[PDB]
Design an enzyme around this catalytic site. Structure first.
Site, short mmCIF file in Angstrom:
data_model
loop_
_atom_site.label_atom_id
_atom_site.label_comp_id
_atom_site.label_asym_id
_atom_site.label_seq_id
_atom_site.Cartn_x
_atom_site.Cartn_y
_atom_site.Cartn_z
CD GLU C 47 -1.71 -2.40 1.64
OE1 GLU C 47 -0.51 -2.63 1.94
OE2 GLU C 47 -2.60 -3.26 1.80
CG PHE C 428 14.03 3.13 4.03
CD1 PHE C 428 12.73 2.77 4.39
CD2 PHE C 428 15.09 2.43 4.61
CE1 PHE C 428 12.50 1.71 5.27
CE2 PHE C 428 14.87 1.38 5.49
CZ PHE C 428 13.56 1.02 5.83
CG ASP C 453 22.84 -1.14 0.20
OD1 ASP C 453 23.46 -0.06 0.07
OD2 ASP C 453 22.92 -1.85 1.23
CG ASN C 480 27.11 1.43 1.38
OD1 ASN C 480 25.87 1.35 1.42
ND2 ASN C 480 27.81 2.11 2.28
CB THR C 482 26.27 0.00 4.92
OG1 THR C 482 27.39 -0.88 4.77
CG2 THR C 482 26.31 0.59 6.32
CE1 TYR C 551 27.57 7.29 -0.34
CE2 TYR C 551 27.23 5.39 1.10
CZ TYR C 551 26.79 6.22 0.08
OH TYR C 551 25.59 5.98 -0.53
C1 LIG Z 1 10.82 4.29 6.77
C2 LIG Z 1 12.22 4.67 7.15
N1 LIG Z 1 12.93 3.97 8.10
C3 LIG Z 1 14.22 4.33 8.46
C4 LIG Z 1 14.84 5.42 7.86
C5 LIG Z 1 16.27 5.80 8.25
N2 LIG Z 1 16.90 5.75 6.97
C6 LIG Z 1 16.88 6.80 6.07
S1 LIG Z 1 17.56 6.48 4.66
C7 LIG Z 1 17.93 4.98 5.15
C8 LIG Z 1 18.65 4.11 4.15
C9 LIG Z 1 20.13 4.41 4.01
O1 LIG Z 1 20.68 3.34 3.27
P1 LIG Z 1 20.81 3.34 1.66
O2 LIG Z 1 19.48 3.36 0.95
O3 LIG Z 1 21.60 2.12 1.28
O4 LIG Z 1 21.59 4.71 1.31
P2 LIG Z 1 22.99 5.19 1.94
O5 LIG Z 1 22.79 6.08 3.13
O6 LIG Z 1 23.85 3.97 2.26
O7 LIG Z 1 23.62 6.03 0.88
C10 LIG Z 1 17.50 4.66 6.44
C11 LIG Z 1 17.69 3.33 7.12
C12 LIG Z 1 14.09 6.11 6.86
N3 LIG Z 1 14.56 7.16 6.21
N4 LIG Z 1 12.81 5.74 6.52
C1 LIG Z 2 -1.74 -5.34 4.53
C2 LIG Z 2 -2.81 -6.06 3.75
N1 LIG Z 2 -3.36 -5.55 2.59
C3 LIG Z 2 -4.34 -6.25 1.89
C4 LIG Z 2 -4.83 -7.47 2.35
C5 LIG Z 2 -5.93 -8.23 1.58
N2 LIG Z 2 -5.30 -9.50 1.37
C6 LIG Z 2 -5.40 -10.54 2.27
S1 LIG Z 2 -4.53 -11.80 1.86
C7 LIG Z 2 -4.00 -11.07 0.52
C8 LIG Z 2 -3.06 -11.88 -0.34
C9 LIG Z 2 -3.75 -13.10 -0.93
O1 LIG Z 2 -2.94 -13.63 -1.95
P1 LIG Z 2 -1.85 -14.76 -1.67
O2 LIG Z 2 -0.91 -14.35 -0.58
O3 LIG Z 2 -1.10 -15.06 -2.96
O4 LIG Z 2 -2.69 -16.05 -1.19
P2 LIG Z 2 -3.93 -16.67 -2.02
O5 LIG Z 2 -5.20 -15.95 -1.66
O6 LIG Z 2 -3.63 -16.55 -3.50
O7 LIG Z 2 -4.06 -18.10 -1.64
C10 LIG Z 2 -4.48 -9.79 0.34
C11 LIG Z 2 -4.14 -8.87 -0.80
C12 LIG Z 2 -4.24 -7.97 3.53
N3 LIG Z 2 -4.60 -9.13 4.07
N4 LIG Z 2 -3.26 -7.26 4.21
MG LIG Z 3 23.79 1.78 1.39
#
Ligand SMILES: Cc1ncc(C[n+]2csc(CCOP(=O)(O)OP(=O)(O)O)c2C)c(N)n1
Ligand SMILES: Cc1ncc(C[n+]2csc(CCOP(=O)(O)OP(=O)(O)O)c2C)c(N)n1
Ligand SMILES: [Mg+2]
Ligand SMILES: Cc1ncc(C[n+]2csc(CCOP(=O)(O)OP(=O)(O)O)c2C)c(N)n1
Ligand SMILES: N=C(N)NCCCCC(=O)O
Ligand SMILES: N=C(N)NCCCCC(=O)O
Ligand SMILES: N=C(N)NCCCCC(=O)O
Ligand SMILES: [K+]
Ligand SMILES: [K+]
Ligand SMILES: [K+]
Ligand SMILES: [K+]
Ligand SMILES: [K+]
Ligand SMILES: [Mg+2]
Ligand SMILES: [Mg+2]
Lengths: 563, 563, 563
Positions: C47, C428, C453, C480, C482, C551
């Site tokens: 979502e 992220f 990554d 990297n 990390t 880096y």
């Molecule tokens: C939802 C979420 N959780 C945690 C963070 C903290 N955070 C920001 S960017 C990031 C990723 C950094 O790793 P990468 O994408 O590999 O880029 P890098 O800094 O190594 O260049 C994280 C863990 C975030 N921004 N968003």
């Molecule tokens: C976070 C979230 N979004 C949407 C749903 C609605 N939903 C429930 S199970 C599911 C996946 C069903 O597909 P699958 O994992 O391949 O099992 P299948 O029904 O094919 O046996 C979805 C989209 C959910 N359960 N959770």
């Molecule tokens: Mg990285």
């Protein structure tokens, strides 16, 4: 055809409710209050009075009670009564009208507020009716949440269109059983009995233990059991404000109630005398909201502490008991009787100097230039209450102010809830509605009220309600033309007063009572006051007595108030 | 000098916590996670995985666990894990960073959200740290609230400046005792023993009683007591999804788990066979969120019902038991044993036709053109689990989808929580984090996961975490390039599919696993699948098996799903 | 008969909506998504992706967009996308299913959460459907609130029974006019013209003024007006992250974008060069959430500030401008054109040492032992983007991490929103959904994504969606092993790393993309990278490139990050 209004009143009646206190607005088009036999409307002059009267009735009866308000400002006026109930712990069902459901636009529709959002932070449960026939289950869920410890109010918001609707309603099918709890449902921790055993071991090793008893012990039905435990083992009993009377007047183990104001009022090391040699405090039915704080018992030698409560400790930052027993209070006492069965009685510590000081205040024969002193007023009330009431009967109600803490120290209580004041909320204007609630709960007993001019006048319009219901409450107004308690705080904080923030002009409370249809008189000394009280007590109608008073503050005497 | 970060980790350690699951953000400047010996950080690829892993570890161990996110979007990602914990009932402490305290302007400061407001509706307790030394009492209050029934998550918001502050913190003063509850604190109605006696009287007169057991009974430690009672009185035991395993596989009183999908899946009167001749249903540790609904047992003759639960009934609109016993489950059973000691064994009702139908599905020898059937997949998993696990050991974990309800019906569970899935929340993606939690809780037992393509791919990145931790989980992905359950619902409501809302393109999960460092293979029949599983179970490393499957829908047969 | 599902989709169409992004759950029984011609469902793997793609599409088109989730954990998964939209400011209508209306017991019913209460703090508007025919007016109110400054998301909760109901719905009567705002409605203070004249008077006295431009100026349609003003008066233009490209690449008044990481990355007094000699800062469409903070421009001599915004200043603790102009940005510029019509052109200050330092990084010819450097990667992307795009076209999208701030400094932007990243929320995994949103808004232009990554893998499953939609996005993953940004913060706060909180094992991103049906290759130097990018740009299908990077931090160089 019967509507949601009939279904609501009918379900309240299934839960034992006989009275609905409140003020009715435009929802009167949807609800008359004659729909159901055996449930009557009690009209007050303000919603606060309705909420507090129901709170006090619920406290004394131990049964859910009900109050009513209109939409918008009715609901907000009722909220101070709801706040009283959440902090003082009483099971009230609070009901308020709302705009037509299809027209609910909070802050945009005329008189339309988000009631559930406003009331939810100060209630056990809060919902809006959406489908008329569901009102039955909503009442049940409200009662369920209200009657679980810590007990409090539940709120239901009622859109006027749904209230007057019969969609889905069928009164030919009888309602399911109500199953109203006889006493509050509680929280119980696994292994509480082992914690209780650990408390018994501390008691064995203790030289001078005390029992500190709160209102939750009274709700649990534990008073006779606690008395028999203290009597056998020779343990002093100390109380919060409303737990006064768990031992009768004159009982040897009756060590009194605590108020943080007591050292300053008596000009005496009162808390030091009560607690200095004590080595074990058992806080039986503890609730921080009752304002008996750990700092107050922490005098003299180091103590061990045992908390017994039907709730998990909400305040570990403030109170870390050595032993914490999370269980029903009566269940604890009955287990504790078994664990301490073979124990030898204790030697109790001496508090005679404290008892003398209090007795000295009550007997104070001096006259004064600026009116009576509050301890002289209460001594007079004690005398006439003892005359008028049967053994173990009678109620003294107190409003909020500096005079209230004199009530805590000096007022007679010969039964549980025999001295009634606001435990956790402390709203001024409390006195009249509490006296209404008390007199309705105890119809054959004397009910005296004491109030100050500031608090009494905040809510004095419901004098007309006392006259209309013909409730034979005797009211004493102690008048100093001031919010006295607040002038004390000014002096504590700043070492001077500021009159624009605390001082009134004169109000003739005698003339005020008479304008409301309540007979009244002025009393200026002991002799005049005793005569007024005895006249009032036998009148068969409500009576008001105005007494000029004054205080002499010692602002340096109140260090125990610090937080 | 030790900061609030040290005091936080130290207090978690005091409550038995050895792992913190999460993703760290810029608060790493205030907290390293090496401050306290014995507590280690477990880094995941997504915060959802962290919250669910903690949830499952909490459920299996019966001990509070911990998860961690950064501010703003970290906290919102963690909130699906929090929602899992609240609906599935597990004691999790959820911790998230916040903007610097003097800079908290929600929706105005960069990455600043009103964390407490967002999480409060889905938690037991939610607070923001304001004074660094108070972190110790906040952790205690969080654990207190999490460990009270219904158990759930508690949330603490941690402004980055206060987290790295040492103001008021003195670690020369040792912490007070933790007093972590050994099992959840419960609510207890006065007179529950009399209600339990009314339940014994109903059982006395009953011809065909049943015990319907939910997760709360397992939390209470009541499994051995329930089994002894069932065996003595010849009372059949029916379960919810995650109470599978309260009796061993093969036990004669093990009458299976209920799912609303069972009649539809089996083309069989399964619910009627289970419930029609039953005259008394005892719902032992009932919780509506588990989705065993009263409509499901209301088949055939009129029944009496007994509800046993450590909470007040939250749903009187839906469930009105004839007898309601509000108490600790184990306490109920122990009282019930005494009240029924003189009772003899009942005649149990016959469900052999239902046992035959289930056995037929599991034995299905057919080879299909368009992939395997899910019941054949589960039968192969059952076989190898029995081979790999010691008696009473092993866990089969299930993600969410149509296939999950085949798991409820068909999967082996030789111990409590031996079949794990999400009861109240049912978020797709659940499988990997639940398998991580289970394998860490039971390090020396085999852990199998079954997941569908839709749900598995929603959270497949944590395959890398499984590799990095070297957890020997064996995963089976049942692939049909579709959100299969949702295609079922399209047909129930509209009598046709709409592909843009449910169909995927092809994903090669074998290659996906190998990209993450996890060995993998494809299996297309029972012989291929058994061989893949046997290799998986002995590998000493994680392993993934992709299986093409198809479903034979009969959409008109799912009427039991109506609400 | 058409249901509320029809009425909802139809009213979205009236507001110009043609796509609904999301994941459908069991509400598929009530809504198919084929009810209305011209509106198509776009299925994602998670979502979060659905919410961001709608946000980015809304940002570029200037029109309200829509996303969709199921009840409970669908809604909480969507909520990170709602948070993106509230902090980054875009008009998204967020829609989630709910339990059947009569079965809504949050935290008690299966998958039932209090959605409105959870979302309200992070949205402009949040409501639950109660009467099916009202969905038309709820959509209108959602659009009204979303399109008022500060623009953001609106949320509607849809109980599945009401969504599938035709009660009160009549489609023979046409809808009233939608009247969708062409641009956001804004706040306007009385006397803003006087304030604008005060600002003109400061501009007359200033020796070295600068324009600092934010995203709100672009939303207002003020870009040509601002450019014309700056060109006449010779005033430098400095931008926030996504305001990059308000002036074309190579324009002499293009003084670049600000990031708080710039001095540390460049190992250079970059903020001092940019701002030291400046005596007047006019912040045009200022928004604190974009993370260009007052502290960042407070270098060298004391400055006067002018704030221009269509909102009352929400942060007077942090930013107290000398002149505050509360009005529409375009309205200010047009009035300001008249007030400054006769002014002589300014003498702008020197930033050539900073320009030279940036150019030096971009041209870096060194081959490193341990991978490429990110400035070399961005340089290569700039070259091929210039080759691939028409003048003033093309989009470079950035996910979140340390590399993102390299993007801010180095990346090409030849049009407004030519460089796209998350301004205020910074979740992220942002990159994939933002590239989807960008590519659909600009179907004929090249779209490059750069991601790390850590962030990329948090949300890599929607590679299948890109493959399925056949969107010709070219992705570069800088790897990297990390969470690099977070390791920097460990070093800033503690002067050392702690690998358990930051380090991953190997992920093969080439193999990963191929498993999802996306062609991919690995590049380790400039020559290989340019070849990979040129292949990808002319492929007509999505393409992924994995580049090893490293880096070398100087943690003492990041003092400008102080809050
Ligand atoms: C939802 C979420 N959780 C945690 C963070 C903290 N955070 C920001 S960017 C990031 C990723 C950094 O790793 P990468 O994408 O590999 O880029 P890098 O800094 O190594 O260049 C994280 C863990 C975030 N921004 N968003
Ligand atoms: C976070 C979230 N979004 C949407 C749903 C609605 N939903 C429930 S199970 C599911 C996946 C069903 O597909 P699958 O994992 O391949 O099992 P299948 O029904 O094919 O046996 C979805 C989209 C959910 N359960 N959770
Ligand atoms: Mg990285
Ligand atoms: C609703 C409310 N507002 C304000 C206060 C502060 N307050 C407490 S008691 C009190 C009354 C003090 O005046 P009075 O009743 O005359 O008692 P006194 O102290 O003079 O004895 C006031 C104003 C309060 N308690 N409740
Ligand atoms: N312990 C204290 N400081 N108590 C404050 C008492 C204030 C309430 C009252 O006296 O009406
Ligand atoms: N009783 C029901 N209708 N159950 C619906 C369950 C929906 C979630 C699931 O199938 O995993
Ligand atoms: N001014 C600052 N300290 N900015 C902090 C931004 C941290 C989030 C990020 O860099 O993606
Ligand atoms: K008498
Ligand atoms: K009043
Ligand atoms: K075995
Ligand atoms: K070109
Ligand atoms: K994900
Ligand atoms: Mg006074
Ligand atoms: Mg599938």
């Amino acid at each position: 055809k019967p509507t949601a209004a009939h279904a609501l009143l009918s379900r309240l009646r299934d839960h034992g409710v006989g009275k609905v206190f409140g003020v009715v607005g435009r929802e009167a088009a949807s609800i008359l209050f004659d729909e159901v036999e055996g449930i009557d409307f009690v009209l007050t002059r303000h919603e606060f009075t309705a909420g507090v009267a129901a709170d006090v009735l619920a406290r004394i009866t131990g049964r859910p009670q009900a109050c009513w308000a209109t939409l918008g400002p009715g609901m907000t006026n009722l909220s101070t009564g709801i706040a009283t109930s959440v902090l003082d712990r009483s099971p009230v069902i609070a009901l308020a009208a709302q705009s037509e459901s299809h027209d609910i636009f909070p802050n945009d529709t005329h008189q339309c507020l988000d009631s559930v959002a406003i009331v939810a932070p100060m209630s056990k449960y809060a919902v809006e009716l959406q489908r008329p026939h569901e009102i039955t289950d909503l009442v049940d869920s409200a009662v369920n949440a209200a009657m679980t410890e810590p007990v409090g109010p539940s709120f239901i918001s009622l859109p006027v269109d749904l209230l007057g609707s019969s969609e889905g309603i069928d009164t030919t099918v009888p309602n399911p059983p109500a199953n109203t709890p006889a006493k509050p449902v509680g929280v119980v921790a696994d292994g509480w009995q082992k914690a209780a055993d650990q408390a018994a071991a501390l008691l064995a090793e203790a030289k001078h233990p005390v029992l500190v008893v709160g209102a939750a012990a009274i709700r649990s039905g534990a008073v006779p059991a606690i008395r028999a435990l203290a009597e056998r083992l020779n343990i002093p009993v100390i109380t919060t404000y409303i737990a006064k009377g768990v031992l009768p007047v004159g009982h040897e183990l009756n060590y009194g109630a605590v108020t943080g104001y007591m050292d300053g009022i008596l000009n005496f090391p009162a808390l030091q005398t009560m607690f200095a040699p004590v080595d074990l405090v058992l806080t039986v039915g503890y609730d921080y909201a009752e304002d008996l704080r750990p700092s107050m018992w922490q005098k003299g030698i180091e103590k061990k502490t045992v908390r017994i409560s039907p709730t998990v400790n909400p305040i570990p930052r403030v109170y870390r008991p050595d032993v914490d027993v999370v269980t029903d209070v009566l269940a604890f006492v009955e287990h504790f009787e078994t664990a301490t069965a073979s124990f030898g009685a204790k030697q109790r510590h001496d508090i005679e100097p404290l008892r003398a000081r209090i007795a000295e205040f009550l007997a104070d024969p001096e006259t004064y230039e600026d009116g009576m002193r509050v301890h002289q007023v209460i001594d007079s009330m004690n005398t006439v209450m003892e005359e008028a009431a049967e053994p173990g009967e009678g109620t003294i109600v107190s409003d909020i102010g500096f005079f209230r803490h004199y009530g805590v120290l000096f007022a007679r209580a010969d039964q549980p809830f025999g001295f009634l004041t606001s435990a956790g909320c402390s709203s001024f204007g409390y006195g009249i509605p509490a006296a209404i609630g008390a007199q309705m709960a105890r119809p054959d007993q004397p009910t005296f009220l004491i109030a100050g001019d500031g608090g009494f006048h905040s809510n004095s319009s419901d004098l007309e309600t006392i006259a209309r219901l013909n409730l034979p409450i005797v009211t004493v107004v102690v008048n100093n033309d001031t919010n006295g308690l607040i002038e004390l705080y000014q002096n504590i904080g700043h070492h001077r007063s500021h009159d624009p923030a605390v001082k009134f002009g004169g109000v003739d409370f005698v003339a005020l009572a008479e304008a409301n249809g309540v007979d009244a008189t002025r009393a200026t000394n002991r002799e005049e006051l005793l005569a007024a009280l005895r006249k009032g007590a036998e009148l068969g109608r409500p009576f008001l007595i105005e007494v000029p008073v004054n205080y002499d503050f010692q602002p340096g005497g109140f260090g125990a108030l610090s937080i």
